[PDB]
């Protein structure tokens, strides 16, 4: 069996699960884990590549009474890729060490402090919260404890399945799987809503149009609702800031991906001479990436001149003081496409 001695065929009668794994580079989450978990104790972080690797490292059968087990099963069954496990108390110390992490997922923990510190402009991070575990208050004050952070989003309610017990799956684990699937399929600029939730996952509480009407502005909550013919869908694509910019998750997450990709594209220019020939090389690299992004459909405009612009040069973006200090400054402006959200049918005879 597991002990191989003779050449030939061995027979096993097991019951271990088997799932599938996708690959999305723009969605690499980190899961907050309770410190009492034996697997994460004594280590800074653990990288999980698939359900097979997790089960091998656990060396135990699948337990539906473990919050971390169900979260990973929900995450992987929804199409998520390789992720990182970090204890909640170590988030502000270990996340900056990791370079490819893009999502900060609260797998049922309280990461309010970590989000307020890590998720800042320029850091290239997005946070996924958990909604209240009780019924939604009709006064519209069920979201008072969330900060108006444009880099975070909340999802309600928690989910249950066939393999469920007194504990319910946190919505963040399943949503993070949706992010991986949508990005690899339709791109990061497409809204991660109006998509089915894989598995037998079902919302624990029903939300109607009247209930969602209160929590779709300001610090908006994203609902997971069931519809008569389409099953269970993600209904909501708004961040925690209600502004003409960063109102929608796709716009905020597209800029996060573009900033990371551009940063990698022109990282060859560091420790190069700070002269005009270097600036032209950097402009070529940035313009090449932006044209490719527009070609894929990630930018709005009929021609590239209407979708982006790049400026770099002396007396255009930087002065003598900037050059003498070793600073190279580039201006990039790109237009994102915003989705249609309200459909109005006008009936007449």
């Amino acid at each position: 069996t597991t002990i191989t001695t003779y050449p030939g065929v061995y027979i096993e009668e097991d019951a271990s699960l088997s799932l599938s794994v996708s690959s999305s580079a723009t969605a690499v989450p980190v899961f907050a884990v309770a410190g009492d978990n034996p697997l994460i104790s004594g280590k800074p972080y653990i990288r999980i590549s698939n359900w097979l690797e997790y089960l091998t490292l656990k060396n135990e059968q699948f337990d539906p009474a473990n919050t971390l087990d169900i979260s990973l099963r929900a995450y992987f069954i929804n199409g998520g890729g390789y992720c990182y496990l970090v204890q909640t108390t170590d988030l502000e110390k270990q996340v900056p060490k990791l370079d490819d992490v893009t999502l900060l997922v609260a797998a049922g923990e309280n990461i309010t402090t970590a989000v307020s510190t890590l998720c800042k402009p320029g850091k290239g991070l997005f946070a996924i919260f958990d909604g209240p575990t009780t019924e939604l208050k009709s006064d519209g004050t069920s979201n008072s404890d969330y900060d108006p952070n444009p880099f975070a989003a909340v999802y309600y309610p928690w989910l249950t399945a066939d393999w469920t017990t007194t504990i319910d799956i946190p919505p963040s684990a399943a949503i993070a799987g949706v992010y991986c699937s949508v990005d690899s399929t339709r791109g990061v600029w497409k809204a991660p809503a109006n998509v089915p939730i894989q598995g037998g996952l079902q919302p624990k509480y029903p939300v109607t149009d009247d209930l969602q009407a209160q929590y779709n502005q300001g610090k908006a909550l994203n609902m997971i609702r069931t519809f008569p013919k389409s099953g269970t869908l993600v209904w909501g694509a708004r961040t925690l800031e209600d502004n003409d910019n960063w109102r929608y998750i796709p716009v905020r997450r597209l800029f996060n991906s573009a900033e990371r990709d551009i940063k990698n594209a022109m990282s060859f220019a560091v420790f190069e001479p700070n002269s005009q020939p270097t600036w032209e090389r950097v402009r070529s690299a940035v313009n090449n990436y932006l044209y490719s992004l527009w070609q894929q459909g990630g930018l709005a405009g009929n021609k590239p001149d209407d979708a982006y612009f790049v400026q770099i040069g002396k007396d255009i973006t930087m002065t003598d003081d900037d050059i003498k200090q070793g600073k190279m400054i580039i201006k990039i402006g790109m237009a994102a496409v915003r989705p249609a959200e309200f459909i109005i049918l006008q009936f007449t005879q």
Partner: protein, 148 residues
């Protein structure tokens, strides 16, 4: 009177009133045709004129070509029908696009039935892309738009 080119187009498949976003790019789509079947009748003393009597209307078939790529909902539907499972219908919308990706002419097809899937030959001496050929038979055709 400015004519339209025939190398910019898009097709969308709707399964259970749900469009498929991954099935819009095709290498070729055959032209759509409608024919009014008629039979010629001849009178007794009429030897210099002809009379044509109208009958039912015949629709053509829809042929598409596409390279081998990742499995998509259109592929899964075709495989299920050709595996012997219950037949299912699909709605197709063909659009002819202008320079601003605005459909100047569009054709809609009702209840299209997958009836044939074929693939190109494996040639050791060739320099070509493996191409799938799909054909569907639909019930009705209807065109919309400012051009036709």
């Amino acid at each position: 009177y400015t004519p339209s080119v025939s190398h910019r187009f898009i097709a969308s498949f709707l399964f259970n009133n749900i469009p498929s976003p991954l099935d819009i790019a095709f290498q070729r789509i055959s032209g759509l045709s409608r024919e009014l079947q008629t039979t010629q009748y001849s009178q007794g003393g009429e030897n210099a004129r002809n009379v044509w009597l109208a009958e039912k209307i015949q629709h053509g078939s829809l042929h598409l070509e596409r390279g081998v790529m990742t499995v998509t909902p259109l592929t899964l539907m075709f495989d299920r029908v050709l595996r012997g499972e219950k037949a299912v219908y699909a709605d197709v919308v063909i659009m002819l696009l202008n320079e601003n990706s605005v459909p100047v002419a569009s054709w809609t097809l009702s209840n299209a039935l997958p009836v044939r899937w074929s693939t190109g030959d494996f040639d050791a001496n060739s320099n070509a892309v493996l191409v799938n050929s799909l054909e569907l038979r639909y019930q009705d055709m209807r065109w919309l738009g400012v051009k036709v």
